[PDB]
């Protein structure tokens, strides 16, 4: 009859807090963070890690609405690149990416690689209303996403 | 021509210079840290998040006995649970799983969530030679796993 | 002007964190791994050659050393083996070896090449403190030895 | 440009290298080694030279969990002694010490500065679970302390 | 009496039908693979050691001929380089090569180290009818060394 | 009684004698090594750590004019770069220096950074009067520091 499932939960509760707090934002499961600074991908990954997250997948389409939605009129790195071999694509945290559907969600017109000025290609993705694949050296801001048993 | 692929294979080379150097062992795709304190389920996990990780997963059977054989004579917290719902059980990180093999790697008879004494059930994994549901306040040692996109 | 090099160290750079990734240790101008499972001495050489190398040698004494300390308190297979003609000994990689200089490193009373209760006699020498003959079907540890350029 | 700093990059990029390939472990700036064998005092401290290290210090005491818990169940020689005057230590590589702080590592009665059968006093420290000055002939492992710009 | 040793015998006389099954050809003791397709020297000497063999080297002049008149008409990587230290050459197996008979296997002026148009030196060898030092880059076919106790 | 005391500060007593046998000259405490030859930065630290100590630092002032003194027309590297990062000094022994103070050792307008032919920038200090940082690559001659508790 001692139930300190209210403490387990309480922590759990407790997490949250912290969250919000934080300005993270709730989605279908997942807390997104939308970031107020501008800094490069790789730079943007390690904080995203240093707050237990990664940059944000699509593991849906509904889900880009939300950023989009919440990042129209703003450009922001998410979480996916090319880096390891030009061709293949592959998300950071671990989602494995269907390329099938995973059309529409990029450019008219991308990727395309472009190379910059500063000798480098593209190999990372941000996103304004539609993919697009960037130098991941350029300082953009960026989303973070973070997985819970909470609803 | 003025190709910095040279500075970008050197930050990545850098980023796992400081994962061996801090004993991150490599296997199959990713890093893993096999803890020499010992914490908490929770406590464990904020660690594996500092450092952009989470508690390891099996999305295969030979990755087990890479871990059995690392942690062979000791108990590993790792990143499964039911948590939420004392029924379903996931994964920290975000793998779907059961059958999914699930199974086998379990004890002769378990999960039991057997009811401890201070005073909570069983919603935490931990390894010795197959899995064992046990109290998430307990202070085991843990492993890490970290994806990466280099071999 | 055009220097690769640099692709090329970092080619070599990179061959060799691969190989401590894998928790390969470097001792004077080689590599050598330690095993974690066991297996007979023939698996144990699959092992080795798969990973471009072969079970250790000893062109020196000071060699030996490093293998004994780091395999004190274990039985560890080495590329040693009478099989051929069950007189003479042969190193598996190729190195030729002189029963002079490898004296001393043998039991106070070996080789024996004893007669097990199956019908095995011992081509197979491992080490504890000093070698020993043994028969080759016995699943024990094993080390591999693997060269380089590299200092 | 033309700039080298690869090349300056990959000159460190490989110190690190030998390091971690002889089993030099990485904590918070510096890089540490577990000896293998055991040796005496100055012998151990000839060898940390060698390796353009020195007997491990304390500048922190998150460091000294470290060391003990990777040296737990172990006893393990420091670069601590006062063998110059019976009174003052002082630590080898440089580090001042005589803090307010600096105890609390100690047994609960130590040091003694306790006499040996074989004529000698105590003047060089050792761990397992907090400093013990001990006779700096007796032969225990050690720990060597190098410092690098490299994080 | 129970004789084991047509089962040891078998499994040797098993792993040779692999090799010849798979087009390896005897020579000395030794087994030649003359590859079908063509690769970098790296990646020619990748396969080598997967098939637990190395680029074949010279102990003798009468194997030199075996691969000539094997060859003849055809460049093929061997396995000597000149990567470390431009000047010293060494192989790839291990062999220590008196670099005195040396002489007379290389080219009428040879090793030569030619500038490649891209930015690569030469630190690789192949054979015509003699050695040539050439860019390691280059896609050349290769032949495979290896040792057995089997004649 | 048994006071092996004569043999422990025989052997301190032996270890200067190597000292200046090898043209050590001691200074306050320390033991300086001033070079014949000439070698760059990291060569030069190669070799002090070999004989177990690091180019030498400035605690104080006094201790400069002993070295200016004894290096007046010569250029000396000392243990001073900034490496890592190009705005931060630092001593390679773990001297923190007393940035406030250090100001009067540096030429009249100096550190400058100068940018070399050779694609370098400057991250090592050497000494003819007052400190002038340096392209590491330039081969100068250089001077040791080593500690003692011997007086
Ligand atoms: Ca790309
Ligand atoms: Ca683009
Ligand atoms: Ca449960
Ligand atoms: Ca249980
Ligand atoms: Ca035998
Ligand atoms: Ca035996
Ligand atoms: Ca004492
Ligand atoms: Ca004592
Ligand atoms: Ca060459
Ligand atoms: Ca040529
Ligand atoms: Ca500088
Ligand atoms: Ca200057």
């Keep these: 009859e001692a139930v300190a499932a209210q403490k387990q ?3 759990t509760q407790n997490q949250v807090l912290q969250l919000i707090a934080q300005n993270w934002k709730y989605f ?3 807390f997104y ?5 501008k800094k490069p991908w790789r730079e943007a990954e390690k904080f995203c890690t240093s707050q237990g997250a990664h940059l ?3 593991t849906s389409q509904e889900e880009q609405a939300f950023l989009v939605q919440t990042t129209s009129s703003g450009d922001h790195w998410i979480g996916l ?3 390891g071999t030009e061709g293949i694509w592959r998300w950071v945290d671990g989602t494995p990416f269907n390329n099938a559907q995973s059309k529409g969600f990029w450019g008219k017109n991308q990727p395309d ?8 290609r593209e190999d990372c993705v941000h996103v304004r209303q539609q993919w697009n ?3 991941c050296g350029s300082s953009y801001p960026w989303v973070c ?3 819970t048993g909470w609803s």
């Excluded at 690689?113 to 480098?120: I, L, M, Q």
């Design 9 to 11: 939960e309480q922590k």
């Design 133 to 135: 694949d960037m130098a």
């Design 145 to 147: 996403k973070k997985s």
């Design 56 to 58: 944000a997948s699509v």
């Design 28 to 30: 279908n499961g997942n």
């Design 81 to 83: 690149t090319d880096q």
């Design 33 to 37: 963070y939308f970031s107020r600074d």
């Design 113 to 120: 690689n472009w190379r910059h000025r500063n000798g480098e």
